[PDB]
Amino acid sequence: VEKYQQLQKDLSKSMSGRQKLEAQLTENNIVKEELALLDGSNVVFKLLGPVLVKQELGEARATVGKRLDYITAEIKRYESQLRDLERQSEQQRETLAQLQQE
Amino acid sequence: NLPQLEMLKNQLDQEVEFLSTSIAQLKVVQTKYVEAKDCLNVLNKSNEGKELLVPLTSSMYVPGKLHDVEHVLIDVGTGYYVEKTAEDAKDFFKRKIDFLTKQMEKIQPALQEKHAMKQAVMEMMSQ
Amino acid sequence: RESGRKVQSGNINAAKTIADIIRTCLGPKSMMKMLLDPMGGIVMTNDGNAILREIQVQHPAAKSMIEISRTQDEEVGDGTTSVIILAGEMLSVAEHFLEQQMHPTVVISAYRKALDDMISTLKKISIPVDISDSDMMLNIINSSITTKAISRWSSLACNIALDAVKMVQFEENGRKEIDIKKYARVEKIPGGIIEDSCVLRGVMINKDVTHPRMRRYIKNPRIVLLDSSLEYKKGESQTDIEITREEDFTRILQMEEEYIQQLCEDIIQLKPDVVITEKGISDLAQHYLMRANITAIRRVRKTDNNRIARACGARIVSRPEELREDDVGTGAGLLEIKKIGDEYFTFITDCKDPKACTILLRGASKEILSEVERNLQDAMQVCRNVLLDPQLVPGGGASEMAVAHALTEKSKAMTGVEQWPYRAVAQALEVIPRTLIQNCGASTIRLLTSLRAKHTQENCETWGVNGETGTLVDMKELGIWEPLAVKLQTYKTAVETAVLLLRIDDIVS
Amino acid sequence: EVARAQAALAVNISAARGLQDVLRTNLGPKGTMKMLVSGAGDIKLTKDGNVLLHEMQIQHPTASLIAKVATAQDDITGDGTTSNVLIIGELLKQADLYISEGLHPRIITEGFEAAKEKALQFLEEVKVSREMDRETLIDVARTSLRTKVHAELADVLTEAVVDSILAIKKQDEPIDLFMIEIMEMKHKSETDTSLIRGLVLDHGARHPDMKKRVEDAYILTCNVSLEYEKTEVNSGFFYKSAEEREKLVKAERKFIEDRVKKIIELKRKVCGDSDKGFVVINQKGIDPFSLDALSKEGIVALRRAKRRNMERLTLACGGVALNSFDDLSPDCLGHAGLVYEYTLGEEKFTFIEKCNNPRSVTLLIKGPNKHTLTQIKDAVRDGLRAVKNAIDDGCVVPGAGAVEVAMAEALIKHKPSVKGRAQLGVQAFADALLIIPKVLAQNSGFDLQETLVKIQAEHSESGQLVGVDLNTGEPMVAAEVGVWDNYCVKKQLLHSCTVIATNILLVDEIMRAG
C-alpha cells in the first residue's frame, strides 16, 4: 500500500544530505586537522558561495569547529523528521491494507 | 510457499543493486585522489613557470602560467578548501584513497550475499 | 526453607514413597502403575524412569532421588527403577531407630560397612560368565531383553549387541577401560529386517550419510580423517594479509594454497581415495585431494568422525601438518556406501583398533527396527556389564538373604553399634524377596523364613525366591543371571544416596 | 494426592459397571439405541459400544482406556464392541470379589492366562465352519444389524449387505475397502438402500439435456477448471494493495471457453458420435456454456466431484483422474454399462453403474435426512464388518452367547490349570463369559439363571451350542435362530477382553502427575 511507502521519501529526504554531512562531519575532523596541519603553508579557504572567499585559519578555525558542530546539526533536523515520518507511516500501514483487502 | 517468495524476491534484488551500484562509484571518487596526487606529481616534477592549460568552461580551456607547485588543494571539511603543501596534499590525495577504499570495498561481499539471499529465494520460489 | 527432623523424616518419606510403589513395578513379574493427569494424561508403566519423569517432586529429596535415579540411568538405564528401592528402605529402616538413637554418622560409615559385605558376598555368589559362549551371555541377555518382554527379533540382534559391544570392547587404559558399550554405534536402516541386520566392522556410518559423500565402494584406499587444522597459512607457519585487490587474489590465495597443498600431500601420500575431513577444512585442502582425485569429505561431525575413527579405527589427526597412515586410514580399512532401503549408508569397515563393530539395525519399518533396538539396548548394556564383570550372579533373593546374614554375621562378629545398622541394612536386602513375593502373589513370611532356611545351609548361594517362578529357587535351575557389575552398581548406588539424603537435614532459601 | 492399594482399583472397576450397564442392551436383537445432547453437546444418535464411548466426553481415565483397545476389535467386528465391554466388568467383579475376599491381583491375573488360552483353545473347538454363502451372510449380517438396528432394518439391509459383498467375493477380497461407497439419499423413508454396482454422484452438475442417460459411458473425471474462484486473490488471499489481485480472473472464463472447444474434439476423437456417450466429471465447478455446449456434443458432464469418487470412478468405471479437456483417448476414459442422472428430492444424483469395475459399489440409503439417516448408515457398514469376519474365517458359530456357557462348562469343572491359584482367575475368567447372553435375555425376557440352566442343561446335555432366543429371553440353538458369531469376533474378543482387564487389574497406584 502507498501508506507503507508514503512518508519514507520525506523521511529519507532529510536523511539524504545528513548522510553526506557525516562524511563531511568526518572530514570536518580532517579539516580541523588540515587547518591545524596548515600553519599558513598554503592558503586556507572556506569555499562558500560561487565567490572564493580568501580565508584564514582563525577565520576557518571556529568555522570548521562551527561546521562540524553544524554538520552535526542537520542530523537533528532529520532526527526531528526521522520519527515524524517513519512513525505515522507505521500507523498508515494497517489503514488502507485491510480496506483494499475489504 | 511460492508467492511469498515471489513477493520477497523483490527487495533482495534491490539489496543486490543497492550494494552493486554503490561500490562501483567510489573508484570514480578515488580517480581524483590519485589524479590530484599525480597532477601534483608532475606538478612538482617539472617546475613553476610551465604553461598550464586549465579548464575555462565547457567547449573551452584557458592557458595559464604556473607560479606555484607547492600550492595544492585538498577538499575536506564540508564545502571547504584547504590548499595544502605538495607533500601534504599528496598525503591526503593519497590518504583519501585509503578511507574511501575501505567503505567501498566492504560492499562487494555484501553484494554476493544479497544475491545468495535472493538466489536462495529464487530456488525456494521455483521450488 | 525446610530443615531438621522433618527433612530427616523427609529424607525417609521421599525416597520411601518413591521406592514404595516402584517395587511392584520391579521384576519380570511386575505390578504396573496407572497415572492420570488433570490434563487427562494416562500412564500404564512398570518403568520407574518413565514414571520418575511425569511425577512431580515438591521435596528436593524426592527431586534428588530423580538425580540419583538418572545416575544409574546415566550409567545403564535399568536398575534405576531398582536403585531407588534400596535407600528408600534404608532411611525408612535405620534412621527412625538410629536418628532417634541419634546419629547421621553411624549408618553412614555402616553404609560402607554395608557396601563391602555385598562385595564380599559378591565374590562368592557372582560366578564368571564367558563372552566366548554367546548363550552364556545371551541367557542373561535373553533374561535381560525379556525384561521388557520382546524376545522376538530383539534376541537374535542381541547377538549383534553380544558382538558389536563386545567387539567395540577396546582401549585398555592400563587398568583396562576396554569393558564398555558406548563405542558401539547403532546403524539406522529403513528397509531390511532384523534378520539381515548384522554387524559390519568398525562403525557403520549412517548419521551424516543420506547419500554417498565418500565414493561408492572403497576397499584398499584409505578412509582418512582430516581434523581441523586444514585452514591455510599465508606465510611459512604464519598468515599475512588476505585477498583484497587484483594480485592479492592471485598472490595471497596462492599463499593460502601452498601451505595446504603441503598439508594435502601428506594425505595423498598414504593413498586415500575417500577422505573424511571434519570441520576446519580448506577448499584449498580439498582441491589437491581433488588434484589426486581423492575425495575430501568436509564439514562432518565429530562423533561421526570418531565413529569413523572407530570405523576403520584410525585416530584423529593431532598434527595435521605432519601426517601418517598410522594416524588416519589405518590397516587396509574399507569404505562402502550402500543403499539399503532408502538411504545410502557409508560402511567404513575392516577396522584396526581392536576390531570394532556396530549394531546393524534393519527394520522393515523403523518401528520393527525400534522394538528390537530398545531391548537390544538392554543387551548392549548387559553386554558391557558382562564385559565389565563377566560374573553371572543368581537373581532373586539369592544375593539378598546371603549378604543379610553375612551382614548380621558381621553384626554377630563386630557386635558394635553398626551391627544394628547392619540388621537395619541387611533388612534392606529382603526387598527382592518381598518384591518378588508381591509380584508372584505368595506369602512372604514363610518364604522369608524359607529363604533364611535357604541361607541356613545353602547360604542362599543360588537360592532366592523368584516371583516369576513364584518359589524359592536355585537360579542355576532357573538360569537367572546378572553380572556382578550390575549388582554392586545398583547396590552401591542407593547406598550412596542412603548416605546422601541422610546427610541433608537442611534446606535454605 | 494419589489413590493407592484398593483405591487404585475400585474407582476403575466401579466405573466399569454403569458404563457396562447403559449399553448392556446396545447389543443383540435386545440392543437399544442411545443419543447424546450431552457429550459433544449436539443432537446425536448412536448405537455401538466403542462408538458411544468416543462421542461422550469421558473424564474417567478407564472409560478412555477401553475405547482404544475396543477400537482395535471394533474395526473388524463393528459389533462386540458393546459386548467386550460387558464381559470385562463381569470379569473385574470376580477378581474384585477375590480381593474383596482378599487375594493378590497378579496371581489373579496369572489365573486368567491358562483360562484365556484354554478358552481360546476352546474357541477353536467351538468354532464351527459355516463357509460363506448368503445364508451365513444373511444371518451374520442380520444378527449384527439385529444388534445394531431393528431385525426389521436388519433384514431390510441384509439384502443391501449381501448385495455389495457378492462383488467383493468377485474381488475374492475377505475385507471390503470398497463397495463400501455409500450414498445417503434425501427422502422421507429410512429403509431404502439401493444397490448400484457402480457409483453414484449427486451430480450431473448444473445442466440437463446433456444426455443424463449415458448407455456407452466414456468418463473424463478431471479437476480442470471449467469454473473457479471469482474471489480477490494475489498471494492466494486478499492482498494489502487492492489492484494486483485483479489481473488473474480475466484468464479464467477464457480458459473455460477454450476447454469447451477442446471437449468438442475430445467428443469427436473419443466418440465422434453422440450415440457413444461421453461423460465429463469435474472435481471443480463447470460454467453453464461448458455443460451447455458439452450437452451439444452428446456429453453429460459432472462438476465438483470428490476424491474417492474420482478414484472410485477411476476404479469402478475403469475411469480416469486425467487432467485435461484436450483430445484424449476414449479407452483411457472409463466405461459403465449404464449411466443415469437420477433425481429424488432437490439434487440430481447420477447413477453410474454396470461400471467396468464392479469395485466401488453404491449401496444407496434413502432416509429422513437426520441423525437418523446418519444412524441407519453406520450400522449396515458394521453389518458387513460382521460378515467380512464370516468371509474371513470359514468358521461361523451360533450367536446370542451360545459359546459362553460351554466354556464355563468346559473350563471350570476340571480345573484348566488343575491348580486353584490360577483356577481363582479361571473361576473369575469363566464368569465373565456369561453376562451378555444372560443380561440380554433377562433384559429381553426370562432371567440369567433359570434361562442359563436351560442353556446350561442343553449344553450340559449336548455340549452343542444352544444360544439365547432374544425374541423371548429363553435359550434356543442359535444355529437355527440365525444369530451367528464368527470365529474371528469371538477369537478377537478374549484378546481385547483379557489384556486390557489384566494390566488395569495390576495397577499398583494412580496419581495426578506432571
Side-chain angles (χ1 to χ4, degrees), chain B residues 31-44:
Chain B
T31 300
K32 63 179 69 181
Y33 297 147
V34 178
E35 179 183 1
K37 179 176 73 180
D38 292 346
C39 295
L40 170 49
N41 287 337
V42 175
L43 176 65
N44 302 135

Side-chain angles (χ1 to χ4, degrees), chain B residues 101-112:
Chain B
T101 302
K102 177 177 71 180
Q103 183 175 355
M104 179 181 73
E105 184 278 335
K106 68 186 185 69
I107 302 171
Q108 188 173 356
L111 170 62
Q112 178 178 351

Side-chain angles (χ1 to χ4, degrees), chain C residues 315-499:
Chain C
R315 73 185 190 89
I316 56 186
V317 292
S318 296
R319 185 177 65 198
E321 293 183 351
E322 182 66 15
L323 293 172
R324 294 171 295 180
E325 185 174 1
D326 293 344
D327 292 343
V328 288
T330 59
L334 294 174
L335 184 142
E336 297 172 351
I337 300 200
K338 297 185 177 75
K339 181 181 171 62
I340 302 116
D342 181 7
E343 295 175 351
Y344 292 121
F345 291 146
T346 304
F347 299 100
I348 295 125
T349 53
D350 185 5
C351 187
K352 306 296 180 292
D353 173 71
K355 288 192 176 79
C357 289
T358 48
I359 295 167
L360 182 67
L361 288 171
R362 298 184 181 174
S365 176
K366 305 301 285 187
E367 178 62 17
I368 187 171
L369 179 59
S370 296
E371 296 176 350
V372 173
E373 181 177 1
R374 293 192 297 273
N375 313 129
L376 176 73
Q377 187 63 259
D378 295 346
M380 65 187 284
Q381 292 173 337
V382 172
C383 294
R384 71 173 300 173
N385 288 131
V386 176
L387 302 185
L388 175 58
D389 187 354
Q391 289 186 336
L392 40 69
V393 72
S399 177
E400 312 311 318
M401 194 68 73
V403 180
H405 290 78
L407 285 172
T408 60
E409 297 169 350
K410 191 178 182 181
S411 295
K412 307 304 180 181
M414 292 179 68
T415 190
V417 292
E418 294 185 353
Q419 61 173 13
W420 302 95
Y422 300 147
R423 300 182 184 88
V425 172
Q427 186 62 58
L429 301 172
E430 302 171 356
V431 53
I432 296 203
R434 296 172 296 178
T435 296
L436 293 178
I437 291 147
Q438 290 178 338
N439 291 336
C440 64
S443 65
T444 186
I445 57 192
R446 299 295 182 88
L447 303 180
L448 294 174
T449 286
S450 298
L451 188 62
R452 291 173 179 79
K454 291 297 186 67
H455 191 288
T456 303
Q457 299 83 1
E458 301 162 349
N459 296 132
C460 291
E461 186 67 14
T462 178
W463 288 270
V465 67
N466 200 31
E468 293 77 4
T469 192
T471 58
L472 271 63
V473 289
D474 171 4
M475 303 300 177
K476 300 182 172 72
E477 68 190 344
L478 270 67
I480 303 307
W481 298 104
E482 291 178 352
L484 185 152
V486 65
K487 280 292 184 67
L488 177 61
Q489 297 170 334
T490 295
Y491 176 82
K492 176 189 61 61
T493 300
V495 173
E496 300 170 350
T497 303
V499 186

Side-chain angles (χ1 to χ4, degrees), chain D residues 55 68 85 101 108 214 230 259 298 343 366 385 403 434 443 487-488:
Chain D
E55 294 174 350
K68 287 177 292 295
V85 175
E101 182 183 3
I108 296 166
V214 171
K230 300 293 183 292
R259 295 289 180 267
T343 304
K366 296 179 183 178
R385 294 182 180 176
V403 180
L434 306 177
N443 291 333
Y487 173 70
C488 296

